[PDB]
Design an enzyme around this catalytic site. Structure first.
Site, PDB file in Angstrom:
ATOM      1  N   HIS A  36       0.944  -0.974  -0.157  1.00  0.00           N
ATOM      2  CA  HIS A  36      -0.108  -0.028  -0.074  1.00  0.00           C
ATOM      3  C   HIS A  36       0.930   1.279  -0.107  1.00  0.00           C
ATOM      4  O   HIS A  36       0.263   2.315  -0.010  1.00  0.00           O
ATOM      5  CB  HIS A  36      -1.022  -0.042   1.069  1.00  0.00           C
ATOM      6  CG  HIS A  36      -0.352   0.347   2.423  1.00  0.00           C
ATOM      7  ND1 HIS A  36      -0.051  -0.670   3.497  1.00  0.00           N
ATOM      8  CD2 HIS A  36      -0.087   1.518   3.142  1.00  0.00           C
ATOM      9  CE1 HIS A  36       0.356  -0.123   4.485  1.00  0.00           C
ATOM     10  NE2 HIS A  36       0.422   1.201   4.345  1.00  0.00           N
ATOM     11  N   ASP A  63      -0.504  -7.292   0.961  1.00  0.00           N
ATOM     12  CA  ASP A  63      -0.071  -6.138   1.188  1.00  0.00           C
ATOM     13  C   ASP A  63       1.515  -6.291   1.183  1.00  0.00           C
ATOM     14  O   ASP A  63       2.261  -6.114   2.442  1.00  0.00           O
ATOM     15  CB  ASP A  63      -0.594  -5.431   2.618  1.00  0.00           C
ATOM     16  CG  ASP A  63      -0.074  -3.989   2.572  1.00  0.00           C
ATOM     17  OD1 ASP A  63       0.471  -3.470   1.865  1.00  0.00           O
ATOM     18  OD2 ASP A  63      -0.475  -3.410   3.794  1.00  0.00           O
ATOM     19  N   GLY A 142       2.605   6.214   8.884  1.00  0.00           N
ATOM     20  CA  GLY A 142       4.161   6.367   8.610  1.00  0.00           C
ATOM     21  C   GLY A 142       5.153   4.998   8.890  1.00  0.00           C
ATOM     22  O   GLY A 142       5.985   4.905   8.203  1.00  0.00           O
ATOM     23  N   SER A 144       3.955   2.125   8.424  1.00  0.00           N
ATOM     24  CA  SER A 144       3.756   1.427   7.391  1.00  0.00           C
ATOM     25  C   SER A 144       5.187   0.841   6.392  1.00  0.00           C
ATOM     26  O   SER A 144       5.720   1.498   6.055  1.00  0.00           O
ATOM     27  CB  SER A 144       2.911   1.968   6.192  1.00  0.00           C
ATOM     28  OG  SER A 144       1.330   2.118   6.699  1.00  0.00           O
ATOM     29  N   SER A 160       1.380  -3.490   8.071  1.00  0.00           N
ATOM     30  CA  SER A 160       0.377  -3.034   7.052  1.00  0.00           C
ATOM     31  C   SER A 160      -0.680  -2.244   7.589  1.00  0.00           C
ATOM     32  O   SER A 160      -1.018  -1.330   7.053  1.00  0.00           O
ATOM     33  CB  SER A 160      -0.373  -4.548   6.707  1.00  0.00           C
ATOM     34  OG  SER A 160      -1.356  -4.354   6.070  1.00  0.00           O
TER      35      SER A 160
END
Ligand code: CL
Ligand code: CL
Ligand code: CL
Ligand code: CL
Length: 199
Positions: A36, A63, A142, A144, A160
């Site tokens: 993502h 993801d 952030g 992520s 994720s």
């Protein structure tokens, strides 16, 4: 520049994510991260300096992504502890529910908790993502793409999502109330033929 797990990278000079793990593919350098975080071909900078671009990704459903990195850059088989040091990555042996785990990313830094569930589906706005592992280390927007790993250096996965609160993180509630979800690293390495850098 150096590629290190957990550190900030920018996507098209517009958004921020966190490096998951340094990897190689054939003679090509790279790192794994969350799908993502960007689309294929999006330009990645580490330090405001261009290092490569998104090579492939799956999101939603899964993801996952990997970013290819130019040959002039240096891959470290490690993760930043956000206090000037690093934790060596030694492999990717998957840990069981109840095992201690930490994560590293640019918003909340280096945080620790336990593995709490497996095979969780997240209902993100862009679509469902299946098969996620849950822990209760906290995180925020952030983080992520960032590293999840055991203290002994076994890479677990890449950040994720989870139950962020109004402040953008779930660090303002106790661990018992958190859902922090990561994509298992094993299937990413297998899908894309990637080898984890270790040290
Ligand atoms: Cl290197
Ligand atoms: Cl388990
Ligand atoms: Cl969402
Ligand atoms: Cl895995």
């Amino acid at each position: 520049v150096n590629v290190l797990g957990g550190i900030e990278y920018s996507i098209n000079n517009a958004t921020l994510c966190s490096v998951g793990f340094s990897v190689t593919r054939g003679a090509t350098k790279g790192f794994v991260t969350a799908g993502h975080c960007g689309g294929v071909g999006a330009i990645v900078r580490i330090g405001g300096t261009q290092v490569g671009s998104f090579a492939a990704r799956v999101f939603p459903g899964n993801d996952r992504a990997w970013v290819s990195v130019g040959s002039a850059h240096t891959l470290q088989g490690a993760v930043s502890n956000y206090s000037g040091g690093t934790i060596a990555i030694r492999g990717s042996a998957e840990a069981a529910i109840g095992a201690a785990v930490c994560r590293s990313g640019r918003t909340t830094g280096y945080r620790c908790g336990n593995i709490t569930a497996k095979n969780v589906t997240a209902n993100y706005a862009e679509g469902a993502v299946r098969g996620l592992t849950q822990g209760n280390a906290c995180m925020g927007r952030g983080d992520s793409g960032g590293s999840w790993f055991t203290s002994a250096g076994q890479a677990q996965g890449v950040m994720s999502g989870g139950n962020v609160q109004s402040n953008g993180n779930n660090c303002g509630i106790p661990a018992s109330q958190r859902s922090s979800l990561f994509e298992r690293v094993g299937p990413i390495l297998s899908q894309y033929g990637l080898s984890l850098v270790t040290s």
